[PDB]
Subunit: 266 residues, 4 copies
């Protein structure tokens, strides 16, 4: 006789879980996650902002890296998200319990975060994480200002309904650097055409390619660094090969068109 | 010396609170709210659907009208909403406690409903109601089927971010009737241009006019019946003067353009 | 170099996941879960009640067993819980999406259920499941009546803060049978003395032993059947060896006292 | 013909809404609410704690008084509550949006706060306010430490299920002062005996009288100052006539016993 299957944990490549020391991107912006998952710390005189946290088990490592940067738990004021999947929003609930931080997100990301990624449009309950509540709901194009750094939300629905690009301006070598943290544009295993849970999926992805192609973007970063050709382990050359926003959008669109053709053939 | 002001209740014109008996719209669709607020009951062999409930104090009247139609509390299966303001979603929390009904709404309407209309983008906490939780989140173009009546969601953001038109096909005199319950297109007292809480408000309203103009629409109904020229007190002629979806969208757009010009002058 | 550990799934003994056909307990009460996890279906003329659902992966099996009993998804009206851990409330969110059922629970169980068992007082995030919202909050001693079966809540805090015993009267061989579904009284790996997250843990367990010892109890059932000496695989003798409520409470108290002494020695 | 009644706002005596300047209670504890509603600010080197905020319309006045005390919005770290009725938790949602503050409350208070006081066991939807989410759930006897001030929760269910007394030690004239902020012990208009929504109401009130009588209590404060014989308008003599915890508990119990006798006669 045959029991029901055991629950399967969301397991990932080791590099996604490999801790790294903080890597400086610009004068106030640092990568503080793992070798293969982005978690950006932006340090202002009026507190710190974290954009993404990676996987659920990364909370203590993130807090250690914040401490190394001079950011104590009370100094973390705001958490922003690219999208509310387990590999990017995983440790948010724990970070809220252990720091002063509040979460700002759009309505779609907020509802997915509040269910811990369960009832995902494409994954069901296969990839979940501890639920968290948003403290502020943002609209498309809304700005949030922390210590004079202005973060602008650009909705780019597709990978999730609530997928968002965040943009801000930092400095480097005395000159402004317009940073674009653009969300994933992948559709891994998704049913694209005629999806009853996401009827306008294709139209949304197409608009999102155009949104990403037009972002203010001297430096592009992505939740999975390989998607924008970053190599966080490469030290002084980590960002040397990074794509432009235009090249990232074009590559994602070509991949998407090929996936559509393969789905029609399947 | 001067105390802080007393809380001010959301008071409305008497006709919005004037009970009426059920008024038949089509073979299975009835208006069961008040003279001046729409609440639509759609009766299927597999249970009943309510679209909107009006003001918070309308719950018992709605239940009385459902009983008169042969719908007991256990028979009410689904509540859908045009938008989550107090004059349309007011009694939802109470209806959920007193019936078998579950709520389906988009993410924007769900988050506003869960805060009881508080922290409204335009009204602040001036117009609130008992909070309720959604049981199902719908995406644009998603269908919900109850007893073979197919309800399709058409997002039409503007009046609220989560504003939705719902369409379904009923019958009358042996022939199909495509019913369009289109949301409000008003912007009462709103700051339209450069609104920090709703940066793309104007673009959203413009897209929503186009969405409404294109809906499948033999009969249009609106949350405030006067907006579509219904007169629920007029008996056999209640719907005689009703606007088409095209005329409703055109009228709303002309009014909106005049409001934009007045805001620029103000 | 050393990555962070992979997430660990909540894995359990195979017998906890071994499907069984419905086993009748009384005229309207059936065990419909697995060999080693209780999930009770109570069938009334006015719909069905489910008490517990076991592990998250049991949802489809529960629905199959309900169908075999003549209970369709629309007929399931109410879900009650012993306590909101993953091995008892696991499939609640999915059952709510797939049936007409609403959840009634005390405030403590409701808050734990809404966080999917995360931030557990003793387990942290080690044992989680998809979050769900309660539709009705019950107080100690409150009754819920479905089709003339009266369910009474008896709070018995300890194993979780919101641990509850549910009692009702069914019939068998023409005579009343007072059924007591008493929650777990175990404290597996818990810090009992001086626990900062549960300062009055010991006092609560002691009161709960007394509560269980006094329940109306012709037949005792427990979330883990072995705790009350049920053997769901034993057919016509499944309940033959079952403990009385008094014996269950006494055994749990003796075990608890031994655990206290071992903790003092450790 | 007769419309349904208009919604009725929760209106209160003017003195409950009369702003006052901060009144010092001890070296770090100040009354910063109105003449007749308590809102306590405790100032530590590691941020400020607010216990209660009064009515919904008091948010801006509270923030003004915090500023006068040298507490900016980012400095407010924690909000604690006596109980989650509109006249004590009214401005919590707004304070969370406008400050860094997080809320800690027991499960019962958290669920009532999250529904904005709707579906009250005794008032229904008659007395509601903007909903807010708790960030931390506390258990009976749990401590929360801010800047070396230790706040201890003492549950005292009755007035609401989640009613809580908070105790801490401050200093005055070089000597320790054990402050007890004890919740309301009133039952205004409540059905006490055989209440289906609160079956053990009487037993809970009786235990709560005993809890209050035993609190560490050099100085008692209450959410309605008159209940403990404070007169916040009396300047240097505001606390001169204050009751002891023992006298407050005894007075509440005598009043409760008289109410029970009147209910039996009614
Ligand atoms: C394409 C990715 C880099 S892989 C990861 C994905 N999770 C969610 O989408 C993920 O692990 N899956 C599990 C295994 C593969 C198929 C299902 C998906 N995140 C994607 C992203 O952000 O673009
Ligand atoms: C234009 C309406 C028919 S009046 C009502 C409105 N409430 C929310 O929007 C409402 O009572 N207000 C209060 C008084 C007027 C100004 C603020 C708005 N609903 C609108 C709708 O659905 O189009
Ligand atoms: C004692 C049980 C029968 S074992 C199970 C427990 N989970 C939660 O408490 C559970 O699997 N653990 C994982 C492994 C053992 C130690 C941590 C606990 N439930 C208990 C119950 O309801 O009495
Ligand atoms: C007895 C109070 C001082 S009067 C106020 C009460 N609200 C909630 O309980 C309140 O205004 N009511 C409205 C009018 C009277 C009857 C219903 C109650 N709060 C009580 C408290 O905290 O002891
Ligand atoms: Zn993803
Ligand atoms: Zn990813
Ligand atoms: Zn409106
Ligand atoms: Zn309206
Ligand atoms: Zn358990
Ligand atoms: Zn268990
Ligand atoms: Zn009160
Ligand atoms: Zn009060």
């Amino acid at each position: 006789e045959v029991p029901l299957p055991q629950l399967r944990a969301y397991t990932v490549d080791a590099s996604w879980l490999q801790p790294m020391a903080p890597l400086q991107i610009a004068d106030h912006t640092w990568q503080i996650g793992t070798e293969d998952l982005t978690a950006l710390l932006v340090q202002t005189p009026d507190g710190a902002v974290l954009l993404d946290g990676g996987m659920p088990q990364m909370a203590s490592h993130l807090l250690d890296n914040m401490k190394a940067r001079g950011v104590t738990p009370r100094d973390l004021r705001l958490i922003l998200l690219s999208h509310a999947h387990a590999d990017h929003a995983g440790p948010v609930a724990e970070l809220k319990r252990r720091t002063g931080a509040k979460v700002a997100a759009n309505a779609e990301s907020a509802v997915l975060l509040a269910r811990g990624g369960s009832d995902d449009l494409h994954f069901g309950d296969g990839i979940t994480y501890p639920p968290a509540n948003a403290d502020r709901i943002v609209m498309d194009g809304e700005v949030i200002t922390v210590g004079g750094i202005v973060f602008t939300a650009h909705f780019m629905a597709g990978h999730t309904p609530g997928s968002t690009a965040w943009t801000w301006t930092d400095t480097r070598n005395g000159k402004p650097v317009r940073i674009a943290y653009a969300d994933s544009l992948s559709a891994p295993g998704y049913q694209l055409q005629g999806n009853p849970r996401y009827p306008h999926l294709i139209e949304d992805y197409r608009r999102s390619f155009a949104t990403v192609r037009a972002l203010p973007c001297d430096v592009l970063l992505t939740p999975h660094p390989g998607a924008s050709n970053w190599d966080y382990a490469a030290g002084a050359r980590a960002g040397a090969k990074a794509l432009t926003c235009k090249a990232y959008a074009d590559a994602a669109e070509q991949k998407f068109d090929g996936q559509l053709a393969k789905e029609t053939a399947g």
